[PDB]
Structure formats: C-alpha cells, structure tokens
Structure 1
C-alpha cells in the first residue's frame, strides 16, 4: 500500500547534521548550552534563518545576520564570545564534515528498485560561499538516485509549514497514506502525521531502517552488497568527433578532472564500461567511454586495413587533437587493451598513464610470423576461424541475442569452449539455440548490445583480428623501447583466453609496471567483478595519474 518514500538530507541522507555543529561548538567552546541554537532560530517564522531557507537571502548574506543574533543572545545570557569566534568558520567546517550516510542511500536505492517513488525534501539554502562547490558535489551525488529533490529555498516554503507537504504530495502524485516520510526533527514530522503519512523519527540510522523495513515489508538492513551505479544510455552525454572524412567516433562523457579514455574489447561497446563510468566520475575524473572504430554509433568502414593498430592509434590521437586534449589516461580491456599498450609505445606524450584489464603486453617476435604464433596456442584457434571474410560474420549476425547471451557469461557458466573452433565449423556449433541469461547481465542489457550491433554487425569488429601481419610489422618498430610512463596490468584469474600467466614477462618491457589481480573473474572483467575493478582503477588513478 506504501508506494513512496521521502527522505530529508541533514540528519537522514547526510551525517553529521549541521544543527549538531551548533551544539558541539557550544560544548567545545564552553558557551551557554543552546546559545547558538537560539541565535540560529531567532525570530522564528520572520527571522533571518527562515528567510534563508525560503530563498529570500543567500547563505553569505545570512552569515552576518547570524553573527548579530549570536551577539544579542550572548548579551541577554550575560556572557562573552571568544576571540576570533567565527560563524563562517563554524559553518564551512560543518558543511564539509557532512558525508552521505551510505546505509540510508542504500535503503532509498533498494526501495526505488522495488518500485517506490523516492524524494528528498530538505530545508536548505542558496549557497554562494567560496567553498560552495563542496555542497554542489554532495547534492549531485545524491539527487541522481531519487525521483524528486525538493528544496525549501527553490519552492519558497519550509518544513514545518503545511503547504510544503501538500506540495510534496502533489509532486509524488500520491495520497498521504501511500507515503513514508523520515526526518530527524520531530516538529517536521508532525504535519506529515496530521495528513496521515507513515513517519519515522530518525535517531540512529539502523533503528530507522528497522522501522522502515517493518513498515514497507522490504529487506533494507543487512542486505547483500549492491552493484555499483550503472548508466542509463539515454541519460548520458553523447559526443561525436570526425577524425577523418569517412570516420567519426562516438563516446559517452561523464565527470570533470583528468581525462580518462575507456577502450572496450571484442565484441563490445561503451556500455561495457557502464559500472566504471559513474564511479570514476565520482572519483574525480573526466570519463570518455568510446565506441571503438567498428562499433555502435562509431563508423564502421568495410576495408580490413582500416582496423590495423597503426591506423586505429593515429585515429585516437586525432580524437585527442579535435577534443583539444593534450593527454589522456588510456584504460583498455581485450582489444582495447592491446591498443592502449600501443598508444603508450608510439605516443607516450599523449598518454598520462596506461592500464589494461586482461590483455598483457607481449612484444612481437621478429623471428616468428604472427600466424605461427597463433597456431602455437590451442586457445587462439577461434582467431584462425575469424580470418576468412564472411564466415564468422554469418555466424555472429545470425542471431544477435543468442550471440551475446552465449559470449557474456561468468567463469562458472560458460557454454563455449574455444576449442577446435575451425574443426567444429563455428563458435556456437555446440552451444544452445536459446541460452539462459548469465547472472552478469539482465535481459535489457543484452538487448542494448543487440540493438547496437544492428547498425553495423560484425565486419568491423572482426576486421580488428584481420591485420595480424601489418600489426606485427609495425610492432617490430617498437622492439627497442620500454614503457616508462605509469602502467597497470590487471589480470583476471579465470580468463581462459587471456590467462594471467601470459602477462608474466611484462616487467622486462615495463620495469615499473603496477599490478592488480581479480579472483574468480572470467573474461568479461568489467561486468563480472565491477566493484573490484572500480576499486583497483581508482586507487591506481589517485596514486599514479593524479
């Protein structure tokens, strides 16, 4: 019967609360108990503070009024205020101290997932202090997870005035008995209770979730660790750059700070990075997630040599040039992995740092043809199957759903050995018509990939595999070099195609190479173990790229 949940910000979705800094300051400075909270509330409905919350005056205009109020409250209680006593100081500090109460955010998230309409209703202020960006950042992180954010200072009303709750109900398109409202201030709860909303007085977070759990009938506490935030494609900024007459590259862009270019693998998409994109933005980076040449909304010219590494790389450089980026951090996976290593070797001036998931760097052997090298590894047999224009295209395009459902599987789920693929006659010859859905992917996510691959199919993606000789020759040019810019190699324990041991010699070529390793992780690193990927990439970025 409950269908909507409404959260306050201070004391509920962010801790510690700013009222708490009034009280602790008093204590810390041994002033009359309550003195600062009296100054804060001075005048009530017609006092400075209400005008703030209603958006009549800015924070900075308020600061000297609160001064005046403290001066008067201390006069009447016959006490002095300390040398250098500063309300700007006290508030700057309070506001940077408050962080997101992670378990309250997680509960809000869970209820939204099961169908609730969620809202933040907060008494707040127009923030124009030199340090405002601090709060701008917090609000940004919170608001994306809610259906509505209602700000006292934007709508010109405040809790506990009754009109804001009517405005609230009217925003939810919900009747008061379909709504739970959590607040840490009981006076603000009263008018929600009068209209007959379920209310929760939030003292400690866990009790409130226990009450919230009871009353909604959904598990909220002790719930397993959730996934990272994923991307909704149609919420993204989509950018497009023509790097040369017949080729434009598409990317999705989120965040500010050092530019970080994500390069997906075969046969994938920018969306392969859907778990990393919000996390790395949040972590203070400008993420550009590409569709690599051949995929999605990027161009897919037909000719094979359009997909040799030399041409691919020159193109990524041109992409930086037209975006006006002198460098970026390049992070790749699978084929996008091989490319970033090559970007490091031929264009180190353009690469802030380089990282690869799964794909090791392995110099070309000048004494052995690349085709020999490939025949030397039973697990690469699929690549010889990929060579004949048309053959693999026909298999892979035949049933896109089945294709992505068969490839994107976790290590304990596979339906396709890479074994004697040529002999068998195809990559799917002995796998089902209608495979089950992997635990890694929802049905909607498979369908996005399917839709992307309707644009150009598999000729462009397959062409990446069809320049063995050209790439070998070009790579041979780099045999005298070492990679000496910052570099990270993440091995995936259960990738049976790019096995971790294939990376074992890499320190000969990259002496200060850094490492991560992910256990129980198959070939589709980013969606198999998103949390562990995010942690390893941010830690490395913050240490080596920042």
Structure 2
C-alpha cells in the first residue's frame, strides 16, 4: 500500500543498500538527478517537480532511512552515516557518470558528507532551506520579539527521554500541522488531504523516532563536518531560500559561500520553508534551468 500517489510514468520501488531496504520513486531518461526530502515529509514533496525534470533527466526520489517506506539505518543517523546509503543508492543507477543532487531541509545534512568526499560523482548541486551542520547553528536565537523562533525545534527534537515522541504520540497530525504552518508563508497549499498523508507517514512509530534521531545526531554531524569542510566544494552549486516567514533569507547563500567555490543563490520573496509546495512554480523553474545548463 503506497503512502502517497505515484505520478504517471514513475515507479515505486526498493533497493537494498548495506542491508537497509530503501524506498524510492523513479522515472525519466537521461543523466541522473537525486532529490532528497526533509523533516516532516517524504519523497512526495518532489512530486510536482519530478514530471517536469523527467523530460530531460532520470529522476530518483528516495525516502530517507526510517522515514516514508524506507527501513531505518543500521549504522546510525549522523550525516556521514546516512550519506553512505544515499551515495550508494545513486551509484546503483548512475555508475558511469556523475549525477545531480537536490536536497531540502535535513536532506542537506544527509548528503553533504558524500558530496564533499566524492566530488567527481556530483555534477551539480542544489541546496535549499537548512544550514549545513556547523558552528553557525549555535547562533540562532531560542526566542524572538515576535514569539517562537524558527529553530527551537532543534533542541526539542534532540532532547533525550524520547521527549518529542512521547509528547507528540496521539497528536501527530496536530503537531505536524502546527510545525508546517509556523514555518510557512503560504499555508493554503497544505490541504486537509496532504496534511493527512504526511501525518500518517511520520506517525508510524519507527518513523516518528527516526525523525528525531536525525536531530539527536546533529551535534555529531557538526563535529564530522568540521573535518570534512577542510575541502571546498568544486562543482556548480545553487542555493534557494525563502524570503518570507519561515525562510532562511540570505543565510543559505552566505553560508554556502564558505563551502563552495562556484555558487549562485536566490531568495524567493513571499515564500517560507516549504519551497517545493509553497512556491512550486518558481522553485521548479530555477532548479530546472540550473540543472539544464549541464548535459541532459
């Protein structure tokens, strides 16, 4: 039983990677583009971009380990550990050619180590709406003059005693709707049905836990990246960020400038965190144009 509807011309499938069964949705022909979702969501956040991209590329959108229909990782949830699964999955489908990577939210955390360690495998890179884990995350404020901050969830989700699972169980739909809307500019794009679909997926007990284990590993990911970042990224990179409520603003590009030699950035006015859904059309156009400057 599929958790989300598969677009016409795409297939829902599974591959075993290092003993972990990963779910993905795949379609199209041409060079490979891997799209990696973030917290609260699954492969389905890419379902509007995928058919357009499939006109020029082979597109694969996996569920992160433990989320959606993917098994939890057997190593751990730190960025370097999870990136192995995603790198090896992509290499099964693009063994002889570099591939493109698009990532949203914790999809960044779970891909940056394999990008920096396997640069010859990455043709072009698109990152949106999350910091690469580094010491800059320790500067975000706990509280603001307008109320709750954008990043206090880092501490809530990383707390021990299974604090987040214990408080959210039985309230999974309520919490996710609040989380999405508090990080959105355009809340109208989140229909009842769409919120229902995402809530049912991450409410699976192993997926609810998996969601927060990414944050319980966040400081380990920071420490990992402190060593990895001694090597700059050399491939063409684009950053996207919202300019409205929930958006990262100039932070996304300004951080990426410290990591990448060849980077262009855009801030989208009137958009918040959930760019593929809040601002699907301009985000799709910018990704498609950026990736189509390469061979396709």
Q: Do the structures match in fold with TM over 0.5? A: yes
Gaps of 5+ in 2: 143-148
- Residue 300 of structure 1 is matched in structure 2 by 72
2:32–2:57 Cα contact (<8 Å) kept: yes
Residues 506/257 of structure 1: CA separation in 2 closer, same or farther (3 Å cut): same
- Whether 1:328 and 2:135 are equivalent positions in the alignment is no
Equivalences for residues 390-401 of structure 1 within 5 A:
390-401=162-173
Superimposed CA distance per residue, residues 126-183 of structure 1 (whole angstroms, 9 cap, x where no aligned partner)? xxxxxxxxxxxxxxxxxxxxxxxxxxxxxxxxxxxxxxxxxxxxxxxxxxxxxxxxxx
SS at match of 2:68: coil
User: Structure 1 residue 334: deviation in Å?
Assistant: 0.6
Partner residue in 1 for 2:146: none
Measured in 2, the distance between the counterparts of 1:234 and 1:539 equals 22
- How do 1:249-288 and structure 2 match up within 5 A? 249-282=22-55, 284-288=56-60
Q: CA deviation at 1:412?
A: 4.4
The answer to whether the Cα contact below 8 Å between 1:343 and 1:351 also exists between their aligned partners in 2 is no
Distance 1:291 1:441, change over 3 A: same
**2:274 counterpart (524, 531, 536):** 524
5+ residue gaps, structure 1, are: 1-230, 414-437
Moved more, 260-269 or 292-301: 292-301
Q: CA deviation at 1:324?
A: 5.2
Distance apart, 1:297 and its partner CA: 0.6
Q: Contact 1:262/1:290 (CA < 8 Å) preserved in 2?
A: yes
Aligned ranges 1:49-448 → 2 under 5 Å = 232-233=5-6, 235=8, 236-245=10-19, 247-282=20-55, 284-300=56-72, 306-323=76-93, 325-326=95-96, 327-361=98-132, 364-365=134-135, 374=138, 377-378=141-142, 379=149, 380-387=151-158, 388-409=160-181, 411-412=184-185, 438-448=187-197
Aligned residues of 2:15 and 2:22 also touching (Cα < 8 A): yes
Equivalent pairs counted in the alignment come to 281
CA shift at 1:448, angstroms?
1.9
Q: Tell me if the contact between 1:411 and 1:520 (Cα under 8 Å) persists in the aligned partners.
A: no
Alpha-carbon shift at residue 488 of structure 1 (Å) = 0.7
Question: Which has the larger share of strand?
Answer: 2
Q: For 1:315-337, what per-residue CA distance to the aligned partner results, in whole angstroms no more than 9, with x for missing partners?
A: 11221343453432110001112
Listed one character per residue, the Cα deviations across residues 34-58 of structure 1 (whole Å, up to 9, x for unaligned) are xxxxxxxxxxxxxxxxxxxxxxxxx
Partner Cα distance (2:245, 2:46) in 1: 18
Compute the displacement of 1:507 (Å).
2.2
Q: Which residue of 2 aligns with 1:221?
A: none
**d(CA) in 2 for partners of 1:325 and 1:466?**
33
Whether contact under 8 Å (2:244, 2:271) holds in the other structure is: yes
Distance 1:506-1:393 versus aligned 2 partners, 3 A rule? same
RMSD: 2.5
Partner deviation per Cα, 1:217-267 (whole Å, 9 max, x = no partner): xxxxxxxxxxxxxx833754112111122x111110121111110000112
Cα offsets for 1:454-503 (capped at 9, x unmatched): 43331111111111332123212223211111111112112536343353
Q: Following the alignment from structure 1 to structure 2, what is the Cα–Cα distance between the partners of residues 481 and 473?
A: 15
What is the deviation of 1:407? 2.5
Change in 2 beyond 3 A, CA 1:482/1:539: same
Matches within 5 A, 1:13-32: none
Using the size of structure 2 for normalisation, the TM-score is 0.85
From the CA coordinates, give the structure whose radius of gyration is larger.
1
Post-superposition shift, 1:405? 2.3
Between the aligned partners of 1:499 and 1:300, the Cα distance in structure 2 is 32
Say whether residues 1:469 and 2:219 are aligned partners.
yes
* Larger RCO: 1 or 2 (CA < 8 Å, sep 6+): 2
* Residue of structure 1 aligned with 2:231, choices 481, 504, 507: 481
Q: Distance in 1 between matches of 2:84 and 2:67?
A: 18
Please state how far the C-alpha of 1:514 moved relative to its aligned partner: 1.7
Q: Given the superposition, is the C-alpha separation of residues 492 and 385 from structure 1 closer, same or farther in structure 2, using an over 3 Å criterion?
A: same
After superposing on structure 2, the runs of 4+ consecutive aligned residues of structure 1 that deviate more than 4 Å are none
**2:145 match:** none
